[model samples]
Target: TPDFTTFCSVGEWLQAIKMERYKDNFTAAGYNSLESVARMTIEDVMSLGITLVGHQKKIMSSIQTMRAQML
Candidate 1:
């Protein structure tokens, strides 16, 4: 499996997450890496107008899984 932490760009990470729609939001918010995305809280993602709970869970779950693999 690809280690998301090593992703070189926000576009790469977003592609991995399969959430390209948030790319602009992430770019505007300056979350341009897996480490930065991992640092994001639910509230932070929600603040980006990602209002769907399932989408939030998918993103958070992916980030958590990536973080665990690093440890």
Candidate 2:
């Protein structure tokens, strides 16, 4: 599963961040890729049942890192 050595996929990022369990919530909300997630806003992630500030912050932080690495 290592497949290379990079966090190139958003799914991998979600799992790496320990937010893997809520991936369905993310999927159901239409965030299936780094680009989509990079476009996220706080209010958007919150409505996905990501009800904690800590996890929310982590996701937002990762999104920026992903965006910076991509495109």
* All candidates: TM-score: 0.79, 0.77
Q: Name the regions of candidate 1 deviating beyond 4 angstroms.
A: none
Give lDDT per model, in order: 0.78, 0.76
**Model 2 stretches astray by more than 4 angstroms:** 1-5
Residue 26 of model 2: what lDDT? 80
lDDT of 2 at 64: 66
| TM-score (C-alpha, index-matched) for candidate 2 | 0.77
lDDT of 1: 0.78
Model 1, 4-45: lDDT tens digits are 567777688778778888889988988866677777778888
Clashes of each: 0, 0
The Cα RMSD in angstroms, rounded to one decimal, for candidate 1 relative to the true structure is 2.0
